[PDB]
Design a protein around this nucleic acid. Structure first.
Lengths: 94, 189, 355
RNA sequence: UUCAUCUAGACAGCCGGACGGUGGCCAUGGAAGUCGGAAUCCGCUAAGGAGUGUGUAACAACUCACCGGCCGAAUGAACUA
C-alpha cells in the first residue's frame, strides 16, 4: 500500500472512514512500476530502469491535483525520472 | 539588455490586435492564493505585472497602429497590471473582486479600519482561555465552549494592528489584511 | 565532531564483521579502541547531602507522562514535551520519612544532539542516580529495549550486575601472564594479548575467578570510571493483556507491570523501588532536644558507617569528630561510645560530639 | 590602472509578496530545504532555490535569494604609488 508515508485526503467527521489516496508522488510509482514496489525494497535499493513502459500517463492528471491544465503530460513525463530515482521512463531528458 | 529584450517581445506581440485594454494596481497581494485565480483563468487574460518600463510602455509605439498607446505615459507610478480578452469585461470583475481571501497582518501591520469585537460564540475546547491577560478580556468557559463575557475594544482609528491584543482577531475570523484586486482604469482599444 | 563519526565507523564495520577465529584478533583490537573513544565522551566523589535521586528513562509517550505526573503529584505545561531539554527536576515525594527526587532523562535517548555541551551534563547527572525506571509499552517493548540498553552500555552504565571478580596487577618483566580458576569458554589468549596491547600494558598478571567476557574484562580495566547500579523495567499499558501471561511477565526479573491510566500496581512499584534502593534511615539527636523523627537523613547499605554519616552531614565534621552515641541494634547496649569505622543500621538514632 | 553594473532606473534603504509539481530518492523516531546520505529538472510570472539561514520529535511559525513599488544618479571589485 506504500513504503513511503502515504498522505491521504481524509477528514474525520461523524463516521467517515475511507482509505482514499490523493494520487501523491510515491503511489503512482506503486501503480505504474511492477507490483514488487511495496515489497522487495526493505534492504534492496534499485537505481535501475529506463524502459518506456507506458505512454498514456495523461490519464492521471485529472486526479493528480490539476496544476498544468494547458499542458497535457509534460509535467508528468519529463519531470519524473530525475527525482524519481527508481527509473528514467523517458529517453527525452534525463 | 539582451536578457530582458524578450519582455519587450512578449509585450509587443500582445500589443498587436487584442482589443481589450485593462490596467489594475496590485500593491498588497497574497500571491499564492492569487495565482489559483491565474489558473482558473487559463487563456482568458494573460496577466502582466511588469517592470519599470512605464516610460517606454507608450513611447515604443512608433508603429502607432493604435496611437492611443500614449494613454498612461503620465502614469509612471504604482503596480500597473495588464490583462486582455476578447469578451465583455463586465463579467470578469464579478470573479476578480470576490476573491477577498485575507490573512493576519505582518504581526502588527496596518489596520484597515476600526474593528468592534462583539460576543460571538466559536465552538472550541478551552485553549488560550488561560492566555487572555495581554488585553484583559473576560472570557468564561461553558459546557466546554469559549464565551466572551464583556465586549472590550481591541483596535482604534489612528493606531494599527497589535501583536499581543491582535493575535486572536483571526480567531474571531475577520479580514483586516486582504487588499483584493482593484480596478483603476478601463479602456477598450 | 569527528569522535562520534569514528565511533560509528567502528560500530558499522564490526557489525558487518562476522565472528570467527580469523576476525577474533581484529575485533579484540577494535573493542579496546572503541572503549578509548567512549571514555573521552565520558570525560568532563558524590557528597550530595540532599536526599536521593532516581531517574526515569523511556521514549516520549502519554502513559509515561501520566505516570510521572501521578508520582510527582504536580501538573503544569509545555516542559514535559520538549525533547531538546536535557533533564527535568520539579517533583519530590516523601516516602517512609525519606524524600526522593526524580528526574526525566530524554537526553539519554539521542544521537542528533548527543555531542553537545549539555549532552555531557545530562549524561553525568543520569550517571549519578540511585535507580532508573526503564519505561516500556508491553505491546512494542523490544525495539526500544535494545536501544535503551545499548545507549546505557555505551555511556558506561551497567544494569543489574556486579563488578566482575577479575584481578590485574602490573609487573615489569615477563610480559602478560594469566591465572585461571574456572575454564574459559569465551576468552582466548589471542584476545587477552589483543586487549592488553592497546592499554600499553607491557607486563602484568591477570587472575580469572569467573567466566568473564571481553566486556567484563574491559570494565575491569575501566573500574574507576564505570558504575554498577540497579535498574527496574516498568511495563505500562498492560490493560490489553490477560492475567495468565501477566503472571508469566512476573517471571521476568525486575519487571513491574502497571497501568498508569487506571493506576494498577503503583503500590508494588513503590515497594520494589524502595526494596532495591536499600536506603537506611538515621535520626540525629542533639544533647537537649529529642530526635525529630520528621526529617531523617538517609544512607546506602554499603556506606552506613559513622565516618560516612559525618561526611554526609559535612566534610569538616569528620575532622571535628569527637565521638558518637548510638541508639539502635548497631551497638550491644545502647548507648555506647563508637568510632568512625562503626557501621550503623536502619532507623538508628545518632548523636555526634564536637572536638 | 583594468574590469564590470547603471535612466531597457544601479548601489543602499524602506514596504509587498516569496507558488505548485513534490513530504524529490534512501536514512525511519523522523526530513515538506533545512540531525544526515547519493542527487538537481520543470510550469504561473517580472520573480520565487527539489533551497541561505532562526527553527519542529517531525509540520506549520519567522528569515533570505528573487523580483516588484518609492527614491533618481552614479555604484561594485582587484591592483598601483
Amino acid at each position: 500500500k506504500g513504503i513511503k508515508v502515504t498522505v491521504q485526503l481524509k477528514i474525520q467527521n461523524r463516521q467517515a472512514a475511507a482509505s482514499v489516496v490523493p494520487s501523491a508522488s510515491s503511489l503512482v510509482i506503486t501503480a505504474l512500476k511492477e507490483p514488487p514496489r511495496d515489497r522487495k525494497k526493505d534492504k534492496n535499493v534499485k537505481h535501475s530502469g529506463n524502459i518506456q513502459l507506458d505512454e498514456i500517463i495523461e490519464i492521471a492528471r485529472q486526479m493528480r491535483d490539476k496544476s498544468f491544465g494547458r499542458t497535457l503530460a509534460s509535467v508528468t513525463k519529463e519531470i519524473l525520472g530525475t527525482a524519481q530515482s527508481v527509473g528514467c521512463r523517458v529517453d527525452f531528458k534525463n | 539588455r539582451e536578457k530582458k529584450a524578450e519582455y519587450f517581445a512578449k509585450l509587443r506581440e500582445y500589443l498587436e490586435e487584442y482589443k481589450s485594454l485593462f490596467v489594475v494596481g496590485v500593491d498588497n497581494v497574497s500571491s499564492q492564493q492569487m495565482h489559483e485565480v491565474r489558473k482558473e483563468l487559463r487563456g482568458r487574460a494573460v496577466v502582466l505585472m511588469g517592470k519599470n518600463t512605464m516610460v517606454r510602455r507608450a513611447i515604443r509605439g512608433f508603429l502607432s497602429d493604435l496611437p492611443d498607446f500614449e494613454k498612461l505615459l503620465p502614469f509612471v507610478k504604482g503596480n500597473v497590471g495588464f490583462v486582455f480578452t476578447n469578451e465583455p469585461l463586465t463579467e470578469i470583475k464579478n470573479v476578480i473582486v470576490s476573491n477577498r481571501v485575507a490573512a493576519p497582518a505582518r504581526a502588527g501591520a496596518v489596520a484597515p479600519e476600526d474593528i468592534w469585537v462583539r460576543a460571538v460564540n466559536t465552538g472550541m475546547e478551552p485553549g488560550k482561555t488561560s492566555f487572555f491577560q495581554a488585553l484583559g478580556v473576560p472570557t468564561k468557559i461553558a459546557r466546554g465552549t469559549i464565551e466572551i463575557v464583556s465586549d472590550v475594544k481591541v483596535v482604534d482609528a489612528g493606531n494599527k494592528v497589535g501583536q499581543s491584543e491582535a493575535s486572536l482577531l483571526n480567531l474571531l475570523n475577520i479580514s483586516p489584511f486582504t487588499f483584493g484586486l482593484t480596478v483603476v482604469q478601463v479602456y477598450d482599444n | 565532531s569527528t569522535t562520534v563519526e569514528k565511533i560509528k565507523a567502528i560500530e558499522d564495520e564490526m557489525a558487518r564483521t562476522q565472528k570467527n577465529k580469523a576476525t577474533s584478533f581484529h575485533l579484540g583490537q577494535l573493542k579496546a579502541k572503541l572503549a578509548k573513544l567512549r571514555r573521552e565522551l565520558l570525560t568532563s566523589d558524590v557528597a550530595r547531602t540532599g536526599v536521593a535521586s532516581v531517574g526515569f528513562v523511556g521514549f516520549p509517550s502519554v502513559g509515561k507522562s501520566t505516570l510521572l505526573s501521578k508520582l510527582t503529584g504536580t501538573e503544569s505545561e509545555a516542559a514535559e514535551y520538549e525533547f531538546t531539554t536535557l533533564v527535568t527536576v520539579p517533583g519530590v515525594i516523601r516516602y517512609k520519612g525519606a524524600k526522593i527526587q526524580m528526574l526525566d532523562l530524554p537526553g539519554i535517548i539521542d544521537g542528533a544532539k548527543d555531542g553537545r555541551g549539555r549532552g555531557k551534563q545530562v549524561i553525568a547527572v543520569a550517571r549519578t542516580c540511585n535507580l532508573l525506571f526503564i519505561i516500556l509499552d508491553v505491546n512494542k517493548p523490544l525495539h526500544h529495549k535494545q536501544i535503551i540498553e545499548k545507549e546505557l552500555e555505551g555511556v558506561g552504565i551497567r544494569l543489574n550486575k556486579t563488578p566482575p571478580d577479575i584481578l590485574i596487577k602490573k609487573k615489569e618483566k615477563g610480559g602478560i601472564s594469566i591465572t585461571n580458576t574456572v575454564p574459559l569458554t569465551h576468552l582466548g589468549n589471542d584476545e587477552i594479548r589483543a586487549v592488553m596491547s592497546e592499554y600499553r600494558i607491557n607486563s602484568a598478571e591477570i587472575a580469572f575467578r569467573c567466566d568473564a567476557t571481553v566486556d567484563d574484562l574491559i570494565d575491569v580495566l575501566e573500574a574507576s570510571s564505570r558504575r554498577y547500579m540497579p535498574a527496574i523495567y516498568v511495563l505500562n499499558k498492560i490493560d490489553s493483556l490477560s492475567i495468565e501471561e501477566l503472571e508469566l511477565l512476573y517471571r521476568i526479573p525486575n519487571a513491574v507491570p502497571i497501568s498508569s491510566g487506571q493506576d494498577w500496581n503503583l503500590d508494588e512499584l513503590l515497594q520494589v523501588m524502595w526494596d532495591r534502593l536499600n536506603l537506611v534511615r538515621i535520626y540525629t539527636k542533639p544533647k537537649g532536644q529529642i530526635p525529630d523523627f520528621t526529617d531523617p537523613v538517609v544512607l546506602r547499605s554499603d556506606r552506613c558507617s559513622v565516618k560516612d554519616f559525618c561526611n554526609q552531614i559535612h566534610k569538616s565534621l569528620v575532622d571535628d569528630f569527637r565521638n558518637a552515641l548510638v541508639y539502635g541494634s548497631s551497638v550491644k547496649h545502647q548507648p555506647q561510645y563508637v568510632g568512625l569505622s562503626h557501621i550503623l543500621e536502619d532507623e538508628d538514632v545518632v548523636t555526634i560530639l564536637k572536638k
